[PDB]
Amino acid sequence: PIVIDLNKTIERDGRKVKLVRATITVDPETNTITIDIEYEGGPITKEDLLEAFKLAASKL
Amino acid sequence: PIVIDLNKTIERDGRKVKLVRATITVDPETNTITIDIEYEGGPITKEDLLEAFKLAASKL
């Protein structure tokens, strides 16, 4: 269970999304990476989750 | 269902891992990003999956 601090905000389309943490779950047997993303902000969307998906990778 | 071409190889610790594709599944209702990673190469590990996890984010 890999944990990454983000501490970055995204104000996309008027939605405040202050990022908190990214909990990465890597499973080498199914070739799958699962990413839990905690944020303290307004309603999140699929476009915003890809942004925090970019940020989590840039921090490791 | 987002699909990203990778076409990059990783020879970490003597394991050839030629990357093929990354199938991203974003779920805004559980704050989870699921990543399927197809590769044509030797045995993959958790360290190698994080590398293709970095590459998939860098391509979008």
Numbering used by the authors:
A (entry chain A), B (entry chain A): 9 to 68
Q: How did the manuscript describe this experimental structure?
A:
Here we use deep network hallucination to generate a wide range of symmetric protein homo-oligomers given only a specification of the number of protomers and the protomer length. The loss function guiding the search is computed by inputting N copies of the sequence into the AlphaFold2 (AF2) network, and combining structure prediction confidence metrics (pLDDT; per-residue structural accuracy, and pTM; an estimate of the TM-score) with a measure of cyclic symmetry (the standard deviation of the distances between the center of mass of adjacent protomers within the predicted structure). To eliminate such over-fitting, we generated new sequences for the HAL backbones using the recently developed ProteinMPNN sequence design neural network (accompanying manuscript: Dauparas et al.).
To evaluate design accuracy we attempted crystallization of 19 designs and succeeded in solving crystal structures for seven (three C2s, two C3s and two C4s). All crystal structures had the correct oligomerization state and closely matched the design models (median Cα RMSD of 0.6 Å across all designs, with resolutions ranging from 1.8 to 3.4 Å). The side chain conformations in the crystal structures also closely match those of the design models. HALC2_062 is a three-layer homo-dimer with a single helix from each protomer packed together between two outer β-sheets (one from each protomer), while HALC2_065 is also a mixed α/β homo-dimer, but has a single, continuous β-sheet shared between both chains, which wraps around two perpendicular paired helices. These two hallucinated structures are distinct from any structure in the PDB, with TM-scores to their best matches of 0.59 and 0.54 respectively.
